[PDB]
Every structure is written in C-alpha cells, then in structure tokens.
Amino acid sequence: MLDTNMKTQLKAYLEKLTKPVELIATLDDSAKSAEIKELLAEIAELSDKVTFKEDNSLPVRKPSFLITNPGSNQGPRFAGSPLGHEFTSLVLALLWTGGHPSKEAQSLLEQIRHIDGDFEFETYYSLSCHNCPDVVQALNLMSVLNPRIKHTAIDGGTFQNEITDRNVMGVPAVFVNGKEFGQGRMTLTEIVAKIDTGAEKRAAEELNKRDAYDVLIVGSGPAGAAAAIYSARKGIRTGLMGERFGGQILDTVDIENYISVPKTEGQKLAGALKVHVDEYDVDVIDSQSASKLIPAAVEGGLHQIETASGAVLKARSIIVATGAKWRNMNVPGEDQYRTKGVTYCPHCDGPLFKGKRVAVIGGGNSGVEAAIDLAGIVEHVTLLEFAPEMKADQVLQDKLRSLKNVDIILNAQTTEVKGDGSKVVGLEYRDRVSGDIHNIELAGIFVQIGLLPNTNWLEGAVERNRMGEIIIDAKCETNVKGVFAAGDCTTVPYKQIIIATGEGAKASLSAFDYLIRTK
Amino acid sequence: MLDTNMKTQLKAYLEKLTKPVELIATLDDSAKSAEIKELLAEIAELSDKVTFKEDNSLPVRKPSFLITNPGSNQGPRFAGSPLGHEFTSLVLALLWTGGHPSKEAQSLLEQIRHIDGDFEFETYYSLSCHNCPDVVQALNLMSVLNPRIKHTAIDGGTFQNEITDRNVMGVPAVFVNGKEFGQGRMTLTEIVAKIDTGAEKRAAEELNKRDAYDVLIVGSGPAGAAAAIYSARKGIRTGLMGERFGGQILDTVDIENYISVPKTEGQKLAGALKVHVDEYDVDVIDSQSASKLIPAAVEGGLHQIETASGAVLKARSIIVATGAKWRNMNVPGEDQYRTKGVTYCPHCDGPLFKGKRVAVIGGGNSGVEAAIDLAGIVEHVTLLEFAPEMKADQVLQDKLRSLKNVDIILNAQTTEVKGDGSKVVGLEYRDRVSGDIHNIELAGIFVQIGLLPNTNWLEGAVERNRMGEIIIDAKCETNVKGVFAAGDCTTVPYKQIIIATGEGAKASLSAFDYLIRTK
C-alpha cells in the first residue's frame, strides 16, 4: 500500500512520537478492507510505538480505523483509504495523537480545548482532491484536542452510496451532527469561528482577574472620559468601562459649541477624547455593559459592578456615567436622514436653520421650549403633539401660541421622514382621530419626545428621579456613599458635551476626596 | 514788518475767514511795541473782517495782543514778535479764530472741547526756533476750542528776563498754571494726552447708550465666555463684560486637563475662547468692572449693572461669572517664579512633580487635601501652617500625619521664594514663635491659603455662603429671579476650566429658559 518513499517519510515522522498510538480497525471481507489491514500493518512495523488492533464488532463503517492512544477511544477515524492526497493528513493524525505538537498558535489551541459543545463532524473527501487535506487536518486536530469534538473522515470512493444518499455535490463536504456545515476549503480558524461561542465568557474571565480599582468609571462617553483623565492624573488605579467609547457624539457630525473649538466633529472628538485618556494610566475596557451595581455593605468597603457578560469588577469608588438615549420617532426615513435634517438637539442644531421651516416632535416641556427656541431663529416651526393636548407647563404653551411663525398640530403621529436622497424635504404624519394622512414641507425635524437615561440597570441600587435620572448633589454624590454620577444620566438639567465633561471632572474630584476620607 | 511775500500769503488765507476777528493789543512805548502796532495795522488793512484795537490798561504783558472774536475775550495771546518762524502760527491763529476749521481728526477736536479742567499755558519761543511752531500752534488751537484752556505764546527775545528768572534752558518751553509742562517738540496729541483724564467718562457714556440686553454676562473668563456662546447661539441680544477677557488662565502657561486637548496654554486658550465668542453676535465689553447689581424691583423687570467707570447697563437677565483670586504668600520671589515652580493648583500641576520635593502652603481643607493628593504623586511634601494648629477637618489631618513622605510645620510663615534665576530651588520661612529663619530645598510651592471670590461688589444683592461664593442651585439660579452665576465665583465645589465652562453653559441655558417664561 505504502511505497518506499511513503514509508521513508512516515518512518521519519514516527521518530518524533513520544506517546504510544493505537490503530483500531473495523473491517469486513471487501478488497478495500484487506488494503486497510495491509496498510495498518506496514505503519505498525515502522514503530514500536504504533500498534495495530482489530475489533470488527464495533458499530462504525467498514472499513474504518480509529487513531487513538492506549486505553482511550478518543481521536480521528478514517473511513476508506487515507492515502492519495490524504497521506499527509494521516501522518499528521498519527503525530498529534502520539504527542507531537501542532504548529498552530496557542490562542487557537486553547480556544479549541475550551469549545463548550458536543459536535460530531464528518468530512467527505476523495483521494485526488487538493482542498480536502486542510479541512480533514483541521477537524482531526480538534478531535485530538477536545473529546467533545469527534471527527470521521470519509473516502467517497469507498462510500459512494453515502455521497449519493446525502446529495454531496463536491468535496470536501462537511456535516456536523448530521447537518451540512461547510463546502470547499475552510481554515481551522474559520471552522473554529463557526462553532465557538465562548468569546464572551473568555472576556469575562479576563475581567474577573482584574485587581480592585480605586475608581471604576461606568460609561465611556465625554463624562466618563473626563472623569478618567481627572482620576488617573492623581495616580490612582483608574478603570474606565463602557459599551462604546465615545458615547452619543459618535452618532453626530458637526459640533459647534464645544467651548473654545469653533467646529469639530463627533467621530473626531471621540478620537481626541481617547488620545487624552490614553496619556494617563487608565485601564480602558470597551464593549462591556454594567448590568448591576452591588453597593459595599458598609462605607469603606468595595463596590461591585456585574457585567452582562458575567464578570464582576470591584472598586473603592464608582462613577456612573452611562448617559442617555433620545427617544426616536421609529418611522421609515428617520435613521436615513440623521445628521441630514433629523436632529435630537435644538441647542446644537438651531443656528443651522435660519430662513428654513422645521418641525418639533413632542409637546412636553422639552418640545415646546425647543419650538419657542427655534421660532426665534428659523422662518417657521410646526410642533406635532401625539396626544389631544400638550403636557408642557401652561406658561410655555401660552408663550408658544403667542408666536406668529408657529403652528401646533395635536393628535398627530409622524409616519415618515421624506428626503431627496440626501437631506430632509418633508414630514408625513397621521391625524390619530380621523386617520387622515398629511404632508408638511420642511428642512429639519427636531425629535423631542423624551430622553431615556441608561439607568434601569441601577434599579433599587441608587435613587433616581421620576425621569430615570440619577439624583445627585452639587458634588455629584448619589444616595450611596462612594457612588457618584456625572453627565446625561444624572439630574443635571441640560444635556450637552461641555456640560457632561465638566460634570465628569467634578465627579472625579469628589470621588478622590471620598477616597482620602475613607481609605 | 510784513514784506510783500508775507502780505500775499496772509491775504490769501484771510480770504478763508467767515467770522470777524479782533486783534486786541496792550502796548507800551518801546520800539517793540511800535513794531507790534505797525504789524497789527498791516494785517487789519488786508481784511474787512480783521479789526485792530488797543487797550493799554489791561494787566497783561507789554507788548502783547489777543486774537479773539467781537464780544469775546477768548483766544491765544502773543507776547512779543509773532513773526520769524512763528508767522505760520500767527496765520493759523487768525484762521481758526475767524471760522476756518482745523485739519485735525474730530476725535481729537471733540476731546479738546471736552477737556474738563482749568489750564493756563505759557509757551516760551524764539523767532529762529524750528520746534516751537508745532507746540505754539497746538496750544493756540486748544485755546480756540476750549475757553477753560488759555494760551500765551511768549517771545523770549522780548522777554529775556522771564527766560532768565524762570530758568528756561531751551525753547519751546511750556508751563501750565505756573508749573513746567514740557520741553522740545510735542504733538497736539501728546499734549492732549498729558492733561486729558476724560477717557473713563467717555467709555462710560458709550456704555450708557447701549440698549438693554436679553442677557448680560459679567466676567469674561472661561465661564463668562462659554455662557456668551451658548446665549448668542439662540440669537438673543447678548452682552459680555469683563475686566480682562480670558480670566485666570492668562496667568498660566501649560494646561493639560482641558478635556480632549492633551496640552494647550493659558494665553493660547484665551485666544481660542475669544475666536469662539466672536463667531456669534456677542457685544464684548473689556476693561470694565461691575461695581453694583440692582435687581429688578419685580420679576420680569430689568436688572441693572453699574460700572466702576460710572455707567449703568440694563438687562432682562444676568449671569455673574466674575471668578476668583487665589490668596498669595506676598513674599519676594513669589511673582517671579509663578509658572516656574510657584503654583496655586494641585489638580493642574501635581503630575509635573514626580520624584520631586514640594511644599504646600496652608493648613485648611484645601491645603491638607492638596498635601495628601501630592504625597501620592511626589517624593516629598512639606506643609506649612501659619497658626499653632491646622484648621482642616480632623479626618484629613489624621490621614496626612499617617503619610510617610510628609512633614508638617506649624507656626510657619513663608518669607521668601528662592530660585536659580529660572525655576524654584527652595523656600525660606520664619518660625513665628522663636523668630528663627529656616530654608527648605524643594522644586514646587503649592499656595493653598484660600480662594477669594470676586463677589464683594454683590454684597446685599445676592446671597453668598460664608466663603464669599455665590450660592447657586443645580440650574445656576441665585436667590434673585433672573440672576444666575457660573464658575469659580459660585458654590461649585471645584475650580477648574472645564468645570467653569460647563457651568457657564448651564447658566446660559437657565437664563434662556427664564426669558421664555417671563418675557
């Protein structure tokens, strides 16, 4: 079966074996079974560390053989001929099983050992195929590294009926637990990536190892970033964790009121915040969400933050800077025209609409103030109120109705934002009583339905007002000793970047003062 | 006396006269008196608008003559010959008196009419002098423009004894009200500049004409500047007044904690604040100090700001952003080493002293917190307390005494800051009990004696805490409706640029909300 060349190479690699290896065949009386038998004999005679056994009573394919260690049933199975262009695959299988290490990275190898699921792989190959080896070898290696991962490599030239019954149209053809998995060349990395779902757990295990922090800042927007800088500058152990470094500003373009910078941009500004943070000793943790706070049982103890990923961080002081989310209209066109006429901020975008018509969505204090605000700058304001009447303070309603370039539409529910492919040109809405549809021509839509502070994760831990805002005092202190908050998520009455950053700096100074008095 | 040339030029200029002119001579029997008499006759005959009179009983020099209008005694007097190189001066005097306008700017001419003091000028000249004319002509013109300003031009070749008695050493020699005033060539501008003290009054009269403001911001540091930007962006009538645009930051160099800007400088930052402000419709008033606030008698009325210069501005809302001043050691060396080792801010300069020895001056909460702060960053901290014991909270004192790289000196009064010509190398101090002088080697001196808010001008108008800080709520509201405050001058618990700017932005949003609800 093997020629002189093949024996020579094989004997060369068998000499790299440390551990003994068993080849357990299950055969019938076919010529192909005889060939396999002859084959395993030739390999065995090339090494005192390779033993050939039969066990023809096993419920596996005939012929096939298992590549395993003494006293084990773990390892790759080859059904049919393992020669032709699978010869290298066979050789590698003997090697790995007998102790010889893979060339793959250790990140990859550990990942494979830690795969947390039960998988039975079957690879259909043929002896002339050039894409098959890499696939077969990848799966083979996994069977060696992880006993929950099983692999049988099948020669389609021996099991033609399986090829036909299973409607395999090309090789290599992979199935996992009976389901089609892949076709064509896949890398070990790719295969591992298809089935591994342990990334979240690994990240969480990294985090669990972190030492306690002097200050742990939750939320990495402008407020959290500012706090981190003020904290780290004092040389204390500072952690900064957040879902997305940069916060709300990543979703805007032009910013013209970040004091002393006449014009910057949301993405650019977040990049600058990151550079400023990285000048100091800040442990920045990204793509993580605090899911619970557990206050120290007594003052001076450690506060604990749990993450959605399952980790627990601990710290002598906490700064909550999780900001907020504006409520959307949830209509077609809305997302598409964000920064192109749809805006959530009159303080920010008001001056860009001189001589233009705009709408304000929402009739509470925010919307109605926004309307009055814009009315003094723009040519015309239409306010849309969903309900039969506005909720805003009466003095605001009176003021707005006194304005000459304003109309108010009650019972009005936006249905669509209309643009010209580039910017907003109008608004479609429904009158909720009659059901009639109406269109308004305008250049801007200020959505002012309400703000949603990112604080429900804190329910029962720290006190919030009736709007979800974390109640703070002048020192950014919550009702929990050692726990502070800064920026949009708090009761700070205005939501702006320069405001958030000032608060993050106050909160950080307060947290430091707290550490001095309790440590 | 006059030749054909001189008569020709003179007659040419007399033809520019609108008003009639009198030449009133007071003479004796000297040859020089005769010449003057002959001279005035020749001028008079060249114009029906020029009349020559005598009145030899007047208590003036003999000879001399006055250049005036009919029914007036106002104008320049020439004593002795007005010829030679004074001929042009004489001609100009006749011109101005008879209606012909000066070539000088109107800013200058009005300034001269508005000079508010009683001055009698005497100019000693000679007929061959080339610097005399400009001086004589300047003073002559002033006598024509302002009846409180009198001028007698004196020919030293006729009044040699006055030249000797008065010890005049060169011409032109000017005296005002009997006192030496000038020597050598002076311009009209220069002369006017020596005696005019009406600039302050004029600036105040400019200000008195200003229309009422929607918002008037007092103090043009980072907080006032931020507020101005947030205000003007809403299109309201915004005034920004301050003693010195830029505030405290003008007195520092490197700034490393203005969030998102890893490093800037005090002067540069103030320049950037100014550019940002000027992008909007802001009426910036500089070099003025609010000296009193007079609250609107009722809510909705106009608030009034008085200035030290005597003006009154008025506005629908006020934002007080007058900041603060750190108390100094008041010792030699202190001013010289500012930004070179003398600092007033641990939050700012702490990180620059790794591996160095520093001192903290002051044993209240600020100083002792600063010491504890620095102790975690620097190699060694010495705190100097003036009194027999520290005033800081006991928990802070206990914490500081627990530190291993710290010593505390009580009864200690700094006497000198010592440097090497460039930076601080040490501190000299007195033990107040024994009187002994001591030296400490160090690289930094953090002065933390206390902060002085710029708020005494507000005594009785708005409520302050026991530290002079303007009491505010979360919305930057004072106890007076329509009056807000932001930044260092308030009860905000930390004094930083990013903090001041955030507050100025909050105060501005609050003031706007107030205008919406009351206008």
Ligand SMILES: Cc1cc2nc3c(=O)[nH]c(=O)nc-3n(C[C@H](O)[C@H](O)[C@H](O)COP(=O)(O)OP(=O)(O)OC[C@H]3O[C@@H](n4cnc5c(N)ncnc54)[C@H](O)[C@@H]3O)c2cc1C
């Ligand atoms: C489109 C748009 C444009 C704007 N333009 C301007 C402008 O031109 N000028 C201006 O002054 N303001 C502007 N704003 C306002 C603004 O950006 C906010 O005021 C500011 O970002 C608030 O900072 P923050 O750190 O307090 O909150 P955020 O910016 O919201 O940052 C909070 C971060 O923490 C994260 N987080 C939330 N929950 C958790 C959790 N459980 N665990 C960990 N992290 C969490 C958030 O996802 C977020 O990334 C704009 C807002 C929007 C939406």
Ligand SMILES: Cc1cc2nc3c(=O)[nH]c(=O)nc-3n(C[C@H](O)[C@H](O)[C@H](O)COP(=O)(O)OP(=O)(O)OC[C@H]3O[C@@H](n4cnc5c(N)ncnc54)[C@H](O)[C@@H]3O)c2cc1C
């Ligand atoms: C040397 C030094 C270095 C510093 N470095 C830093 C730093 O690196 N980082 C940092 O965050 N902070 C720093 N600070 C702190 C800091 O600059 C202040 O926090 C900040 O400037 C406060 O801004 P403000 O507008 O509230 O007050 P101010 O900056 O004090 O501005 C107030 C202005 O109003 C004026 N004014 C006062 N009275 C009147 C009146 N009656 N009428 C009209 N105007 C008046 C003041 O003279 C002043 O010009 C430093 C301070 C000093 C002294």
